[PDB]
């Protein structure tokens, strides 16, 4: 519910390749970095099952060669939330044939792009599953 | 990387017909991705940009159709220009390639303006509302910036609007409600009757289900009236299902027991407890800390001690670390436990899942429940905490040392003890800053004054002129008070301890010299550093200069009326004050509604039992929630049987003017409208003083002689007082008496023969001997040093 | 006078940390020559800019500590013959002119002005 503060999707070098504040209220790439940096540097590829940094929900992941960030609030229930994370990872493999990859990311963002605007726009989620989708895309 | 050049110039590229979609898109890509990644630039290129990107639009490359909506997607409330597509949007409205259509509205409505807001609107609402759920979504998204913006707009649409939000679709049904968020932020009622939808219906997503709980809660707050039912009903449906949010939510707050609610619902919660206990829901740390709430009741607390002790006994999960510093805190613990853990702990708390940080909450937890107090702890605690260590400590510290101050400990000589020492070989010059600020004034309140020297010297040993100073500064708080022994010797020491090394030399000589300079008890000095309640309302009353008689007030109301019920739009509480005199009612309020303020403002009460009725008072102007004084005057007839108690009737009148809170208008025009004022009665009690006698004895009687008047009843259906008794000890506010008050849950028989003084002076006297045969007769008195009270108090009582 | 003006134009000329409350004791003395030998108001308006300029900047923001002020007799400091030139600086605690100055110098604001040109 207009409760994206980002989603990125993060490199495990402290490098954001995606990030989409979907809702933001503080700025700066900077700062965007530094807040990174105090909880990337901190979680180190490693995540946690859950994290709540700022009374705020973090539910970040990693992959196999990515970091997964969302920023939420923790007001907002877990179950579903990593459902959405769920379904970011669980999708993209499938239907690409293949998750994540850093070599993935590298040849071409746009799937991602195309598939995020999709899921999610903003602070509100739109959608969380995959089928959906796949029948929706044809990309 | 990133950069715009090569792209502006890449714009050629528009210039082909010979391009492969995939060709552009990547091209297309590339701006994007700078973007993506973050990039800042000039309007005049991005307008640039889109001319020259807009200029492509013959085809329904489909793919075309979408990247452009990114394009586009990337301006939203920091746009440049509407208009260009515009056909382009219509186009598709007419043109059914659905899917496209959709996007495009959607990014244009934080972008939006009023005019061009005309624009969509039969349509609309048509397409809000059309066909396939797919399409019927992209629609919805697409206002809520807009409603950043405004949204109203569409507001308006409503008794009509809702219905529509019928849905049939889980995901969409989830959907239409938080826009419902917004809806129930504008109401409340709507909400009641609609409940009884919401209510009526079982529900779909999961997701609906979970705004309105938070709604649901919300209102039950305060109580959301009778959830009994449901709250049951609803316990059932948040309990069980097969999507797990809804049992938990619930079950955080839910709890309900310093001696309440855990019937059921301590089972159900077990079994979720338990369920959980092993990260299903690695939510259930949280809950600990506070939504689900825990400080206990006695036997049920020794029940708590296996799922805290699973958590304790695992050690991991980042949502365990937690869990284990929550439930353990909550529930509390024994001692000896303690002790095991500190091993425990021991190991844990560098890193164990990054311990440190939920430990550090632990921690400031642990400063709290004993700040300086269970010391025993305490002091365990230092060592340990000393001990553990790492270094980490120093943080908790800030917040320990807090905690000690917080309590103001008084196991100081211990805990100081401690602190002492240990900080000594426990170092960290940063923490010998604060705390020797605070020392710096406690000083001789507590005293032990040899081990405190003791030690004050030792704080100084270390080097650091800076370390040194402390010792000095802290002192003078502590000197100026001198202690068991000080005064003397404080003269002594100064003398016995002193210092070279400049500016060290100076620090030595210059607090002599400051000592040099002042008296040494004046430098102390320095550098360590009726007519009534009522009556006042008669003064507070009196800066308006229109009247038509006051006096001195007397006794104020007995209670003030809203003369508006609640939260009305001209919300009015009205407090009445009596003098000698005149009674004024001086009207305190909020003209609530925002639609008005309220003009040409006055008064009306019209009276039953007299008073003279000079005038009616208003306000010149009231704006929205803000006091303004009206007032209502008349002079009090004091010698007549029936004249201050009255009811008067009440109407507003004003010419109400419409606001702009924006930036308004106030302009000679509006039209009057007057509402019901409501009534005033006067009291037996805004008049008086309740009293004890200056001659009860004679007085007693002598009010009898020239004044009584009297009535009888005989009391034949109830036996009791009481009924009466709530309307005399309440109405006339005035003490029963002559040790003749008292009565127990029950008792034999009762007199009170009762006080105060009316207004104009004279003074009202009741007596009233309630006689219990076993039916009650009573002789009620009522006799007076005024006229008009002895008929009043037969009356006035009731 | 030669002292003070030099002091002035080094302060300007540096500006990048320290710490001293205790030099202004230093320079100060028992007793000094300041002013002309007195201005009264527009004196009171003298010690007001000079050291206000210094107190603008103490009031501005921090990152390490430079000396946290215990500057009580500070303010006696900056307000027979002994005795009343006493009272006067009691009383404290051209002249216009001097005033006005102060208030221009009014040094966190110029601080801030910095880091904004800066960015």
Known sequence: LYTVKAILILDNDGDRLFAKYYDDTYPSVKEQKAFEKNIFNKTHRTDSEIALLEGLTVVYKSSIDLYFYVIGSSYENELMLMAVLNCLFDSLSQMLRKNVEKRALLENMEGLFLAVDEIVDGGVILESDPQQVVHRVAL | HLEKSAVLQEARVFNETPINPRKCAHILTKILYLINQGEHLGTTEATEAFFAMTKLFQSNDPTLRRMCY????????????????????????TGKEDNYRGPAVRALCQIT????????????????VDKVPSVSSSALVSSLHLLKCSFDVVKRWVNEAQEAASSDNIMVQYHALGLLYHVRKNDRLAVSKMISKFTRHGLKSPFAYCMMIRVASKQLEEEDGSRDSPLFDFIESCLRNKHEMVVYEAASAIVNLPGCSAKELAPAVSVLQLFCSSPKAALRYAAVRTLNKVAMKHPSAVTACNLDLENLVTDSNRSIATLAITTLLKTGSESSIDRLMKQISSFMSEISDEFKVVVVQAISALCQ??????????????????????????????????????????????????????????????????????????????????????????????????????????????????????????????????????????????????????????????ILNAATRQEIFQEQLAAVPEFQGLGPLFKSSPEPVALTESETEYVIRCTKHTFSDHLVFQFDCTNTLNDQTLENVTVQMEPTEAYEVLSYVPARSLPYNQPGTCYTLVALP?????????????????????????????????????????????????HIQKVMKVNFEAAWDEVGDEF??????????????????????????????????????????????????????????????????????????????????????????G | EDIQSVMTEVRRSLGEIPIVESEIKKEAGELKPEEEITVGPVQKLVTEMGTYATQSALSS??????????????????????????????IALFVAEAMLLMATILDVDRISLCLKVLS
């Open chain 2, 70 to 93: 990114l394009t586009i997607k990337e301006m939203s409330c920091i746009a440049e220009d509407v208009i260009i597509v515009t056909s382009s949007l219509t186009k598709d409205m």
């Open chain 2, 113 to 128: 303006d009023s005019t061009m807001l005309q624009a969509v609107e039969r349509y609309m609402k048509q397409a809000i």
């Open chain 2, 369 to 526: 429940k004993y700040p300086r107090k269970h010391a025993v702890l305490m002091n365990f605690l230092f060592t340990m905490l000393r001990e553990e260590g790492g270094f980490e400590y120093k943080r908790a510290i800030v917040d320990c040392i807090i905690s000690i101050i917080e309590e103001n400990s008084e196991s100081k000589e211990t805990g100081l003890s401690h602190l002492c020492e240990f900080i000594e070989d426990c170092e960290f010059t940063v923490l010998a800053t604060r705390i020797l600020h605070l020392l710096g004034q406690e000083g001789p309140k507590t005293n032990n004054p040899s081990k405190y020297i003791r030690f004050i010297y030792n704080r100084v040993v270390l080097e650091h002129e800076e370390v040194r100073a402390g010792a000095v500064s802290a002192l003078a708080k502590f000197g100026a008070q001198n202690e068991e022994m000080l005064p003397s010797i404080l003269v002594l020491l100064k003398r016995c301890v002193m210092d070279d090394d400049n500016e060290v030399r100076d620090r030595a000589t210059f607090y002599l010299n400051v000592l040099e300079q002042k008296q040494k008890a004046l430098n102390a000095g320095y």
């Open chain 2, 638 to 686: 004091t010698e007549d049987p029936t004249a201050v108690a009255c009811t008067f009737s009440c109407v507003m009148k004003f010419t109400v003017k419409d606001c702009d809170p924006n930036t308004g208008e106030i302009d000679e025009e509006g039209y009057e409208d007057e509402y019901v004022l409501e009534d005033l009665e006067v009291t037996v009690a805004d």
């Open chain 2, 708 to 797: 009584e008047k009297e009535e009888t009843f005989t009391l034949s259906t109830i036996k009791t007082l009481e009924e009466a008794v709530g309307n005399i000890v309440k109405f006339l506010g005035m003490h029963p008496c002559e040790r003749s008050d008292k009565v127990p849950e029950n008792k034999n028989t009762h007199t009170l023969l009762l006080a105060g003084v009316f207004r104009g002076g004279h003074d009202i006297l009741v007596r009233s001997r309630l006689l219990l045969l076993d039916t009650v007769t009573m002789q009620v008195t009522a006799r007076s040093s005024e006229e008009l009270p002895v008929d009043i108090i037969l009356a006035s009582v």
């Open chain 3, 61 to 90: 923001s921090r990152p390490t500590k430079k000396e946290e002020d215990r500057p009580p007799l500070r303010g006696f400091l900056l307000d027979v013959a002994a005795s009343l030139a006493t009272t006067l600086t009691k």
